[PDB]
Amino acid sequence: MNLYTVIFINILLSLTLILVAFWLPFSMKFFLVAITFLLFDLEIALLLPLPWAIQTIKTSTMMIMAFILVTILSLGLAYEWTQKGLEWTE
Amino acid sequence: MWFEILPGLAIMGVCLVIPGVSTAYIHKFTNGGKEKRVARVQYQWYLMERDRRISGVNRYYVSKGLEN
Amino acid sequence: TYKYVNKKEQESEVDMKSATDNAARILMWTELIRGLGMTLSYLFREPATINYPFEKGPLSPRFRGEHALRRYPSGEERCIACKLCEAICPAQAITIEAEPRADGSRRTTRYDIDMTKCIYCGFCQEACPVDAIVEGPNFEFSTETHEELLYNKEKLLNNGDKWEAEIAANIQADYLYR
Amino acid sequence: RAEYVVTKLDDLINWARRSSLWPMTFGLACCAVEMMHMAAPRYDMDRFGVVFRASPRQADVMIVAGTLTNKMAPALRKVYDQMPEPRYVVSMGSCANGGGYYHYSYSVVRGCDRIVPVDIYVPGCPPTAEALLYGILQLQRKIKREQKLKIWYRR
Amino acid sequence: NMTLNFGPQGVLRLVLELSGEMVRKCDPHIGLLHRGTEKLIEYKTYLQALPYFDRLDYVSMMCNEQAYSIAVEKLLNIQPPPRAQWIRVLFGEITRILNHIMAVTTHALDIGAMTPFFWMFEEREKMFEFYERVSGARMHAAYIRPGGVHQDLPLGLLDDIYEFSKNFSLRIDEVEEMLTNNRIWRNRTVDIGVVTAEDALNYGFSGVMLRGSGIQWDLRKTQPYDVYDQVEFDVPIGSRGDCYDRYLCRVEEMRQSLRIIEQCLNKMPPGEIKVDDAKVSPPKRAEMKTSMESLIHHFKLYTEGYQVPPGATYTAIEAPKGEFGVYLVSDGSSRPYRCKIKAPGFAHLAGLDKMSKGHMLADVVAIIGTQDIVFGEIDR
Amino acid sequence: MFFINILTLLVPILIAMAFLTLVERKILGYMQLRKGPNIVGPYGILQPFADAMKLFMKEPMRPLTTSMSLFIIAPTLSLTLALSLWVPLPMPHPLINLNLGILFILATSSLSVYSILWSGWASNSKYSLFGALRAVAQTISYEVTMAIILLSVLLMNGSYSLQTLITTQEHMWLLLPAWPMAMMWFISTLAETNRAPFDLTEGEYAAGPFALFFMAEYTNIILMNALTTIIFLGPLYYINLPELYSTNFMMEALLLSSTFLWIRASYPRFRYDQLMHLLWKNFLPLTLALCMWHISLPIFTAGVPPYM
Amino acid sequence: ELVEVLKRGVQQVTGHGGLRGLLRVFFRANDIRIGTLVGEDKYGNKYYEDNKQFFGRHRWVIYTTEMNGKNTFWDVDGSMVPPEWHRWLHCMTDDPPTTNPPTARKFIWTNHKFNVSATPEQYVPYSTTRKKIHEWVPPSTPY
Ligand SMILES: CCCCCCCCCCCCCCCCCC(=O)OC[C@H](COP(=O)(O)OCCN)OC(=O)CCCCCCCCCCCCCCCCC
Ligand SMILES: CCCCCCCCCCCCCCCCCC(=O)OC[C@H](COP(=O)(O)OCCN)OC(=O)CCCCCCCCCCCCCCCCC
Ligand code: SF4
Ligand code: SF4
Ligand code: SF4
């Protein structure tokens, strides 16, 4: 109930301020950026549960899989780099 | 000189100190002179509900002890 | 004689020492902390600011500000209507019209200056052979209408009577340079 | 009486509008180096509340500094129109007051007061930053001497 | 092609045709500050016209008076005296310092570094104080005139100039620490607006835009006009033709200016200040008020000024922005028949389009700053 | 009592932003060899109220080709997020004690792109849309490291909670370790907040909306510096002295917020292309490398932290 | 050397007419410096000096609260400074009136007037030359 109260309060305050305000008187580069950001945000999604995965017993396995993730992500980055995907010189 | 920005720095510092100590004092006031018990898992919630049920006044922070 | 900027006397050394120095410069952000230090030093100095209406900026006895039509100790005017000021004024800002006065003298009936045409060059007081028109020291005479800056004989004579206690002293100071 | 509180309200509104003056510096020519020198330490434009230079879309005052030509008048008028009321104008220099040293030219507007309405005229070619500051404080007082709510009340 | 109009809303109007973030076409627009100086001058004596040059390229104003003075003296076939020449050199160098402060700091301002502006405009105030102490006006001192100089220096000016020259070096160093080796400055400037020497020549460039590409052309070491032949100073040349090289050149120029000022002060000679030819330069006021001939000459000079034998000249001055020239045509009259002003910013803007090839929208604002574009000398 | 706590939290942070404006102006002035505001009130403490009155008293020239919906809900959203971020912060005890609190911070920070983009799509032009696209791309790109840094530093404390970092730094700051992760975190806070040298979006709104945007900006500034203080500069926590913790937290947050302005006055701007190269070629490689390093550290060391 | 600074500060504070004068000064002229009183002018203004401050702040003025019928407690102008003190305050001199007095001449204004850009006693221009062309007036009786 408390979170609801706080957010409602903030919204009310914002709308009140903005009411008083009135009542007183194509390039593919950006698309490629968005796509790269998708492919890294999903990696964040696959990477966030490490604070719970590092509590397990299969440490030799979590080590492995996390290294796989990071390594192949770096390789994809390097390839997008070599292929001039981070240049901006139209 | 450089010692004329303090009239504002100190204002902001006081405004940034108020939240913390205010919240602490209000917690100590609403929860019987004790911190607000946290519940990261169900075990602590069970302990809390149990204290509340044994209180007899429906409040988890009314510790009873041996006398009861 | 010439010099070189952005040219080295000879190639450098790729030694591990210099390479590591440059890598430290890059990673540790070394050349920027010095700018931060310059800004901190300036924070810890005295600013050159002044309370304006209470503390005024320094000027010289040659400052060219507002205009004035002067007089003699007797009180008689000085302008003899010779029109050299009107003839030298680059912006054609001085309009003059004269006549013989009932006492038989060369004196003006009309002397108008347009401050929206004056470029404040002093040629008029350089030309006046009698020291009658002077670009005085005052600079604080802004207005709210474009019609208060069209001066005339009366306004200029009032300014002279007003500021003579200062114009005379500044002229006493500087007249040996001109 | 309501008159007392209305006077106080107008005084407060004017205090704010005169202590938060933001200029659009329409700087065209050699009457702009002086505005820069006025922002500089010795005069510290920013010390009275007058920001150095803001956007023409959230500004309050507009400083016309230098010769305005017939190729530049429409842009100045468009800026004046885009600006939000209540807006004030300050003409800095002979060029903008009456054309000055080019008043008899074919490509000069003989006064910014023909393209936009002016509130404070500063004379000089160029006027010292001290004089420009004097003029801006004169504008401050012109604002402090307004009676908007009073005239709306006794209407 | 994502076209846009940029600059106005301070008289510049660029029309930019982009391709994505790159810049393909830069069309500058001119005449937003065209007043008609060259035509008005035709209706004014050879002295009623001097202020116009103070008003052109309004950051120096005295390297502008100086060109007109030299041209009219070349026509009259006179020469001013040593003290006038030395004062004129000294103050020309001071105007150089002012202009270069202006350039570097407005460059860093339009780029984003703004504290040098305030650190250095105080020095600019202190030098406007000299301007005023000698002429009575902070900026537009109609002080240098054909025949020499209007007035002599007051008795407490050289000492002040010495106190100022003492510390301007430490100020330049204060700025250099922040700017020259900063990786962000170097990234904004290096390899920007490159231009080769032959193309510069064929485009009509002058000054730092020449000697930042390895060329050796300074109109004070070559084609000298004042006693500059009696004073020593170095000319900094570049190696790559980029904004960084030009920045360093302007800085070292601000330094050579102090090197020249030390010498000018130490070697200031005594004597008169304006040619003692009262048919050109007015007489003193005591002589005017006691002698007949002097008064007649004053009258004629301030009503129907001095007459100039017909001819034509092109006198070039090494102004802070480059070769400032005056094609001055004369009839045997008190007034000129034509005065054409050659300004470097003209050709520099003309070449902006080629200098902005293979560059973004945020590099053009620096390419401009590297030319010191003032529109008074351009639009005239 | 809870509403009173909410007031005690909200009012002071707004006051602190309003006065951080003045502190910025004064500091920049004294670094530029001038004073700054001195007049309106003693040392200027009335100038922010004056400016607020002025703005809110202006007349809004709402673009005609626009959409009122996206015109009003953009600054509303900005301020709502900028205020709801301050909620979970342990100072030392939090108003709302959340687990996954730093994740709530990440999300409620990443949600501002919507406003910074709707404003542009609303303003009917192409230059404003260009600027909005570029700013969105910048913010987006730097969110990546803003997330990975925390993902790697939250393995010295095995929990996404902010009330665990206190005991994690009960003996030593998390700066000595991960000072290379901070230097990359301290900057993504500038680029995320479009703060110089990353102000390529403010270097087109009425009085009220501009004011709300300003408030959001400076609130986010204070909050990012507060997060830095709590994470990498863990202050003192003696169970009986929340007063001490709050004092130290305030001091460090003010240090950081003054450092931001130090920087604004000290350095030039960047060029969008170079700004993006910075991340995608210097920060992401090092970030992933140090992420692997910090995944291995708690293993080849027996110092793997707990889950309480 | 910090306690000496604090002592200089406390004396700068108490160096006025107690709290009332301190507030008056600090709120009209945002400055609480102490200086030597070189003189005072007919209109109630005071002029202070201190040669150890830097050039531009080594001289200053406290204006009058009333000038020719006007509440100048808040409104204040550099136009209030009469000429003799204007010349010493803008540092054209090293000598003030008290020691170097002006030349006593009639037709010089005894009472100084400040800027009147909008007051009812302001300046309105006009032509000072008489009529040039005189017309013909016929008599007031016919034929
Ligand atoms: C156990 C042994 C092994 C363990 C593994 C770890 C070993 C240590 C690894 C070293 C880590 C190095 C530090 C990590 C960050 C480095 C990032 C970096 O170097 O950025 C490079 C970039 C410039 O790159 P570039 O353009 O190529 O250089 C010019 C070429 N001549 O530079 C930039 O562009 C940066 C731009 C900065 C602009 C803003 C600067 C503001 C600085 C303010 C001060 C901040 C101080 C930190 C604050 C902390 C916050 C609490
Ligand atoms: C017109 C203008 C429009 C602009 C509006 C912008 C509003 C955006 C405001 C920011 C959004 C905040 C997002 C809130 C997510 C909450 C996430 C969270 O952590 O809450 C979980 C909470 C605690 O759970 P946990 O931490 O896991 O463990 C607790 C055990 N002790 O357990 C809970 O689940 C608590 C109950 C959930 C409360 C969430 C309510 C969030 C605020 C609602 C906003 C409503 C706005 C209007 C409707 C939106 C449009 C439809
Ligand atoms: S100072 Fe003004 S009025 Fe006098 S000659 Fe020059 S332009 Fe004309
Ligand atoms: S030059 Fe002097 S005397 Fe001659 S008309 Fe002009 S003001 Fe009068
Ligand atoms: S009035 Fe004089 S200084 Fe001002 S812009 Fe015009 S010519 Fe330049």
PDB file of N, CA, C and O and ligand atoms in Angstrom, chain C residues 25-29 31-33 36, chain E residues 183-184 187, chain F residues 175 179-187 190 197-198 228 232-233 256 259 263 267 270 278 282-283 286 290 293, ligand 1:
ATOM      1  N   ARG C  25      48.945   7.887 -18.610  1.00  0.00           N
ATOM      2  CA  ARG C  25      48.276   9.116 -19.023  1.00  0.00           C
ATOM      3  C   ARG C  25      46.875   8.832 -19.544  1.00  0.00           C
ATOM      4  O   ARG C  25      45.932   9.577 -19.257  1.00  0.00           O
ATOM      5  N   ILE C  26      46.721   7.760 -20.320  1.00  0.00           N
ATOM      6  CA  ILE C  26      45.428   7.461 -20.928  1.00  0.00           C
ATOM      7  C   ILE C  26      44.453   6.939 -19.879  1.00  0.00           C
ATOM      8  O   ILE C  26      43.369   7.498 -19.678  1.00  0.00           O
ATOM      9  N   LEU C  27      44.821   5.849 -19.205  1.00  0.00           N
ATOM     10  CA  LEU C  27      43.901   5.190 -18.283  1.00  0.00           C
ATOM     11  C   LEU C  27      43.575   6.074 -17.086  1.00  0.00           C
ATOM     12  O   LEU C  27      42.402   6.313 -16.779  1.00  0.00           O
ATOM     13  N   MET C  28      44.599   6.563 -16.392  1.00  0.00           N
ATOM     14  CA  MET C  28      44.416   7.269 -15.131  1.00  0.00           C
ATOM     15  C   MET C  28      43.903   8.692 -15.301  1.00  0.00           C
ATOM     16  O   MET C  28      43.668   9.366 -14.293  1.00  0.00           O
ATOM     17  N   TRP C  29      43.726   9.168 -16.531  1.00  0.00           N
ATOM     18  CA  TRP C  29      43.156  10.489 -16.775  1.00  0.00           C
ATOM     19  C   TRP C  29      43.995  11.572 -16.096  1.00  0.00           C
ATOM     20  O   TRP C  29      43.550  12.274 -15.188  1.00  0.00           O
ATOM     21  N   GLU C  31      46.111  14.204 -17.719  1.00  0.00           N
ATOM     22  CA  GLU C  31      46.125  15.563 -18.251  1.00  0.00           C
ATOM     23  C   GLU C  31      44.857  16.342 -17.931  1.00  0.00           C
ATOM     24  O   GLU C  31      44.817  17.550 -18.184  1.00  0.00           O
ATOM     25  N   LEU C  32      43.831  15.692 -17.385  1.00  0.00           N
ATOM     26  CA  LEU C  32      42.580  16.358 -17.045  1.00  0.00           C
ATOM     27  C   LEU C  32      42.542  16.818 -15.595  1.00  0.00           C
ATOM     28  O   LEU C  32      41.929  17.852 -15.281  1.00  0.00           O
ATOM     29  N   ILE C  33      43.180  16.063 -14.701  1.00  0.00           N
ATOM     30  CA  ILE C  33      43.218  16.453 -13.300  1.00  0.00           C
ATOM     31  C   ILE C  33      43.964  17.768 -13.140  1.00  0.00           C
ATOM     32  O   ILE C  33      43.711  18.524 -12.196  1.00  0.00           O
ATOM     33  N   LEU C  36      41.375  20.349 -13.694  1.00  0.00           N
ATOM     34  CA  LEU C  36      40.619  20.413 -12.445  1.00  0.00           C
ATOM     35  C   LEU C  36      41.369  21.229 -11.399  1.00  0.00           C
ATOM     36  O   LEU C  36      40.767  22.016 -10.657  1.00  0.00           O
TER      37      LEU C  36
ATOM     38  N   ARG E 183      42.807  15.795 -24.056  1.00  0.00           N
ATOM     39  CA  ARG E 183      42.437  14.864 -25.115  1.00  0.00           C
ATOM     40  C   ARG E 183      41.166  15.299 -25.827  1.00  0.00           C
ATOM     41  O   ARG E 183      41.022  15.064 -27.028  1.00  0.00           O
ATOM     42  N   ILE E 184      40.247  15.956 -25.119  1.00  0.00           N
ATOM     43  CA  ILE E 184      38.984  16.339 -25.743  1.00  0.00           C
ATOM     44  C   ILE E 184      39.201  17.499 -26.707  1.00  0.00           C
ATOM     45  O   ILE E 184      38.644  17.520 -27.811  1.00  0.00           O
ATOM     46  N   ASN E 187      40.845  16.032 -29.714  1.00  0.00           N
ATOM     47  CA  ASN E 187      39.912  15.297 -30.556  1.00  0.00           C
ATOM     48  C   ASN E 187      38.992  16.235 -31.323  1.00  0.00           C
ATOM     49  O   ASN E 187      38.619  15.940 -32.463  1.00  0.00           O
TER      50      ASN E 187
ATOM     51  N   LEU F 175      35.506   1.076  -2.934  1.00  0.00           N
ATOM     52  CA  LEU F 175      36.273   1.828  -3.917  1.00  0.00           C
ATOM     53  C   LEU F 175      37.648   1.209  -4.140  1.00  0.00           C
ATOM     54  O   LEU F 175      38.039   0.966  -5.285  1.00  0.00           O
ATOM     55  N   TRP F 179      37.765   0.339  -8.071  1.00  0.00           N
ATOM     56  CA  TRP F 179      37.987   1.727  -8.450  1.00  0.00           C
ATOM     57  C   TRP F 179      38.030   1.867  -9.970  1.00  0.00           C
ATOM     58  O   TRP F 179      37.747   2.956 -10.485  1.00  0.00           O
ATOM     59  N   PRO F 180      38.364   0.817 -10.732  1.00  0.00           N
ATOM     60  CA  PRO F 180      38.177   0.919 -12.186  1.00  0.00           C
ATOM     61  C   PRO F 180      36.725   0.803 -12.603  1.00  0.00           C
ATOM     62  O   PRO F 180      36.365   1.281 -13.685  1.00  0.00           O
ATOM     63  N   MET F 181      35.879   0.183 -11.779  1.00  0.00           N
ATOM     64  CA  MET F 181      34.456   0.127 -12.083  1.00  0.00           C
ATOM     65  C   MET F 181      33.747   1.416 -11.697  1.00  0.00           C
ATOM     66  O   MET F 181      32.749   1.783 -12.324  1.00  0.00           O
ATOM     67  N   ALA F 182      34.245   2.110 -10.674  1.00  0.00           N
ATOM     68  CA  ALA F 182      33.681   3.400 -10.297  1.00  0.00           C
ATOM     69  C   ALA F 182      33.964   4.449 -11.363  1.00  0.00           C
ATOM     70  O   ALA F 182      33.047   5.100 -11.875  1.00  0.00           O
ATOM     71  N   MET F 183      35.243   4.633 -11.699  1.00  0.00           N
ATOM     72  CA  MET F 183      35.625   5.585 -12.736  1.00  0.00           C
ATOM     73  C   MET F 183      34.775   5.444 -13.991  1.00  0.00           C
ATOM     74  O   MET F 183      34.541   6.432 -14.695  1.00  0.00           O
ATOM     75  N   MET F 184      34.307   4.235 -14.288  1.00  0.00           N
ATOM     76  CA  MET F 184      33.380   4.029 -15.392  1.00  0.00           C
ATOM     77  C   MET F 184      31.933   4.249 -14.984  1.00  0.00           C
ATOM     78  O   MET F 184      31.091   4.512 -15.848  1.00  0.00           O
ATOM     79  N   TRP F 185      31.634   4.147 -13.689  1.00  0.00           N
ATOM     80  CA  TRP F 185      30.292   4.424 -13.197  1.00  0.00           C
ATOM     81  C   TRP F 185      30.088   5.914 -12.957  1.00  0.00           C
ATOM     82  O   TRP F 185      29.006   6.447 -13.222  1.00  0.00           O
ATOM     83  N   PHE F 186      31.118   6.596 -12.457  1.00  0.00           N
ATOM     84  CA  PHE F 186      31.011   8.028 -12.211  1.00  0.00           C
ATOM     85  C   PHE F 186      30.742   8.800 -13.494  1.00  0.00           C
ATOM     86  O   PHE F 186      30.170   9.895 -13.449  1.00  0.00           O
ATOM     87  N   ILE F 187      31.136   8.251 -14.638  1.00  0.00           N
ATOM     88  CA  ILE F 187      30.980   8.944 -15.912  1.00  0.00           C
ATOM     89  C   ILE F 187      29.633   8.641 -16.547  1.00  0.00           C
ATOM     90  O   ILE F 187      28.939   9.546 -17.018  1.00  0.00           O
ATOM     91  N   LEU F 190      27.170  11.021 -15.708  1.00  0.00           N
ATOM     92  CA  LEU F 190      27.141  12.259 -16.479  1.00  0.00           C
ATOM     93  C   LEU F 190      26.398  12.060 -17.793  1.00  0.00           C
ATOM     94  O   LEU F 190      25.467  12.807 -18.114  1.00  0.00           O
ATOM     95  N   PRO F 197      30.660  16.636 -19.674  1.00  0.00           N
ATOM     96  CA  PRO F 197      30.845  16.897 -21.108  1.00  0.00           C
ATOM     97  C   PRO F 197      29.907  16.124 -22.036  1.00  0.00           C
ATOM     98  O   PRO F 197      30.238  15.961 -23.209  1.00  0.00           O
ATOM     99  N   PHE F 198      28.763  15.663 -21.532  1.00  0.00           N
ATOM    100  CA  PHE F 198      27.852  14.860 -22.337  1.00  0.00           C
ATOM    101  C   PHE F 198      26.496  15.541 -22.471  1.00  0.00           C
ATOM    102  O   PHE F 198      25.452  14.911 -22.279  1.00  0.00           O
ATOM    103  N   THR F 228      26.488   6.672  -5.700  1.00  0.00           N
ATOM    104  CA  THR F 228      27.939   6.528  -5.625  1.00  0.00           C
ATOM    105  C   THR F 228      28.399   6.471  -4.174  1.00  0.00           C
ATOM    106  O   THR F 228      29.181   5.592  -3.792  1.00  0.00           O
ATOM    107  N   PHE F 232      30.149   2.855  -3.493  1.00  0.00           N
ATOM    108  CA  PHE F 232      31.602   2.836  -3.550  1.00  0.00           C
ATOM    109  C   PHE F 232      32.263   3.557  -2.386  1.00  0.00           C
ATOM    110  O   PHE F 232      33.477   3.421  -2.206  1.00  0.00           O
ATOM    111  N   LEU F 233      31.504   4.304  -1.591  1.00  0.00           N
ATOM    112  CA  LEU F 233      32.029   5.077  -0.470  1.00  0.00           C
ATOM    113  C   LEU F 233      31.200   4.820   0.779  1.00  0.00           C
ATOM    114  O   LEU F 233      30.750   5.746   1.458  1.00  0.00           O
ATOM    115  N   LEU F 256      30.428  14.920  -4.280  1.00  0.00           N
ATOM    116  CA  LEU F 256      30.251  14.410  -5.638  1.00  0.00           C
ATOM    117  C   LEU F 256      29.471  15.392  -6.513  1.00  0.00           C
ATOM    118  O   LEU F 256      29.830  15.625  -7.679  1.00  0.00           O
ATOM    119  N   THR F 259      31.654  18.006  -7.538  1.00  0.00           N
ATOM    120  CA  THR F 259      32.591  17.522  -8.545  1.00  0.00           C
ATOM    121  C   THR F 259      31.979  17.591  -9.938  1.00  0.00           C
ATOM    122  O   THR F 259      32.669  17.912 -10.913  1.00  0.00           O
ATOM    123  N   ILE F 263      33.632  19.710 -13.006  1.00  0.00           N
ATOM    124  CA  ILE F 263      33.888  19.180 -14.341  1.00  0.00           C
ATOM    125  C   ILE F 263      33.257  20.071 -15.404  1.00  0.00           C
ATOM    126  O   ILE F 263      33.890  20.407 -16.416  1.00  0.00           O
ATOM    127  N   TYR F 267      36.018  21.238 -18.330  1.00  0.00           N
ATOM    128  CA  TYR F 267      36.288  20.547 -19.582  1.00  0.00           C
ATOM    129  C   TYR F 267      35.422  21.039 -20.734  1.00  0.00           C
ATOM    130  O   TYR F 267      34.353  21.624 -20.521  1.00  0.00           O
ATOM    131  N   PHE F 270      31.916  17.023 -25.887  1.00  0.00           N
ATOM    132  CA  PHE F 270      32.256  15.890 -26.731  1.00  0.00           C
ATOM    133  C   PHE F 270      31.516  15.993 -28.058  1.00  0.00           C
ATOM    134  O   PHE F 270      30.650  16.848 -28.258  1.00  0.00           O
ATOM    135  N   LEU F 278      33.580   6.175 -27.247  1.00  0.00           N
ATOM    136  CA  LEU F 278      34.061   6.032 -25.881  1.00  0.00           C
ATOM    137  C   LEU F 278      33.481   4.782 -25.241  1.00  0.00           C
ATOM    138  O   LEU F 278      34.213   3.854 -24.882  1.00  0.00           O
ATOM    139  N   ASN F 282      35.866   1.486 -25.230  1.00  0.00           N
ATOM    140  CA  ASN F 282      36.756   1.608 -24.090  1.00  0.00           C
ATOM    141  C   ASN F 282      36.088   1.100 -22.823  1.00  0.00           C
ATOM    142  O   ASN F 282      36.751   0.511 -21.964  1.00  0.00           O
ATOM    143  N   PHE F 283      34.779   1.318 -22.688  1.00  0.00           N
ATOM    144  CA  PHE F 283      34.107   0.997 -21.438  1.00  0.00           C
ATOM    145  C   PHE F 283      33.510  -0.398 -21.443  1.00  0.00           C
ATOM    146  O   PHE F 283      33.460  -1.046 -20.393  1.00  0.00           O
ATOM    147  N   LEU F 286      36.485  -3.200 -21.140  1.00  0.00           N
ATOM    148  CA  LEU F 286      36.953  -3.229 -19.760  1.00  0.00           C
ATOM    149  C   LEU F 286      35.858  -3.706 -18.823  1.00  0.00           C
ATOM    150  O   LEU F 286      36.130  -4.417 -17.849  1.00  0.00           O
ATOM    151  N   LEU F 290      36.390  -6.941 -16.484  1.00  0.00           N
ATOM    152  CA  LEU F 290      36.290  -6.864 -15.033  1.00  0.00           C
ATOM    153  C   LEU F 290      35.098  -7.654 -14.510  1.00  0.00           C
ATOM    154  O   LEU F 290      35.123  -8.118 -13.369  1.00  0.00           O
ATOM    155  N   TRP F 293      36.507 -11.000 -14.239  1.00  0.00           N
ATOM    156  CA  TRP F 293      37.420 -10.951 -13.103  1.00  0.00           C
ATOM    157  C   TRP F 293      36.670 -11.062 -11.784  1.00  0.00           C
ATOM    158  O   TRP F 293      37.102 -11.776 -10.876  1.00  0.00           O
TER     159      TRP F 293
HETATM  160  C1  LIG H   1      45.218  -7.650 -10.133  1.00  0.00           C
HETATM  161  C2  LIG H   1      45.880  -6.967 -11.329  1.00  0.00           C
HETATM  162  C3  LIG H   1      44.908  -6.857 -12.505  1.00  0.00           C
HETATM  163  C4  LIG H   1      43.522  -6.429 -12.026  1.00  0.00           C
HETATM  164  C5  LIG H   1      42.690  -5.941 -13.210  1.00  0.00           C
HETATM  165  C6  LIG H   1      42.521  -4.424 -13.151  1.00  0.00           C
HETATM  166  C7  LIG H   1      43.873  -3.746 -13.369  1.00  0.00           C
HETATM  167  C8  LIG H   1      43.681  -2.242 -13.540  1.00  0.00           C
HETATM  168  C9  LIG H   1      43.128  -1.952 -14.933  1.00  0.00           C
HETATM  169  C10 LIG H   1      43.306  -0.473 -15.273  1.00  0.00           C
HETATM  170  C11 LIG H   1      41.952   0.233 -15.295  1.00  0.00           C
HETATM  171  C12 LIG H   1      42.113   1.586 -15.979  1.00  0.00           C
HETATM  172  C13 LIG H   1      40.999   2.528 -15.534  1.00  0.00           C
HETATM  173  C14 LIG H   1      39.681   2.098 -16.170  1.00  0.00           C
HETATM  174  C15 LIG H   1      39.062   3.262 -16.944  1.00  0.00           C
HETATM  175  C16 LIG H   1      39.911   3.596 -18.167  1.00  0.00           C
HETATM  176  C17 LIG H   1      39.016   4.157 -19.269  1.00  0.00           C
HETATM  177  C18 LIG H   1      39.862   4.909 -20.292  1.00  0.00           C
HETATM  178  O1  LIG H   1      41.038   4.771 -20.298  1.00  0.00           O
HETATM  179  O2  LIG H   1      39.240   5.758 -21.215  1.00  0.00           O
HETATM  180  C19 LIG H   1      39.991   6.086 -22.349  1.00  0.00           C
HETATM  181  C20 LIG H   1      39.495   7.426 -22.880  1.00  0.00           C
HETATM  182  C21 LIG H   1      40.476   8.001 -23.898  1.00  0.00           C
HETATM  183  O3  LIG H   1      40.794   7.056 -24.875  1.00  0.00           O
HETATM  184  P1  LIG H   1      41.621   7.606 -26.189  1.00  0.00           P
HETATM  185  O4  LIG H   1      40.770   8.613 -26.923  1.00  0.00           O
HETATM  186  O5  LIG H   1      41.950   6.450 -27.104  1.00  0.00           O
HETATM  187  O6  LIG H   1      43.011   8.329 -25.677  1.00  0.00           O
HETATM  188  C22 LIG H   1      43.605   9.316 -26.471  1.00  0.00           C
HETATM  189  C23 LIG H   1      44.643   8.677 -27.391  1.00  0.00           C
HETATM  190  N1  LIG H   1      45.806   9.537 -27.504  1.00  0.00           N
HETATM  191  O7  LIG H   1      39.394   8.307 -21.799  1.00  0.00           O
HETATM  192  C24 LIG H   1      38.214   9.054 -21.757  1.00  0.00           C
HETATM  193  O8  LIG H   1      37.717   9.446 -22.758  1.00  0.00           O
HETATM  194  C25 LIG H   1      37.571   9.366 -20.411  1.00  0.00           C
HETATM  195  C26 LIG H   1      36.752  10.652 -20.511  1.00  0.00           C
HETATM  196  C27 LIG H   1      36.758  11.341 -19.153  1.00  0.00           C
HETATM  197  C28 LIG H   1      36.022  12.675 -19.229  1.00  0.00           C
HETATM  198  C29 LIG H   1      35.546  13.089 -17.836  1.00  0.00           C
HETATM  199  C30 LIG H   1      36.690  13.028 -16.825  1.00  0.00           C
HETATM  200  C31 LIG H   1      36.185  13.492 -15.464  1.00  0.00           C
HETATM  201  C32 LIG H   1      37.131  12.991 -14.377  1.00  0.00           C
HETATM  202  C33 LIG H   1      36.607  13.418 -13.009  1.00  0.00           C
HETATM  203  C34 LIG H   1      37.376  12.686 -11.912  1.00  0.00           C
HETATM  204  C35 LIG H   1      36.787  11.291 -11.722  1.00  0.00           C
HETATM  205  C36 LIG H   1      37.613  10.525 -10.692  1.00  0.00           C
HETATM  206  C37 LIG H   1      36.888   9.238 -10.301  1.00  0.00           C
HETATM  207  C38 LIG H   1      35.693   9.567  -9.412  1.00  0.00           C
HETATM  208  C39 LIG H   1      35.327   8.342  -8.579  1.00  0.00           C
HETATM  209  C40 LIG H   1      33.843   8.375  -8.226  1.00  0.00           C
HETATM  210  C41 LIG H   1      33.670   8.061  -6.745  1.00  0.00           C
END
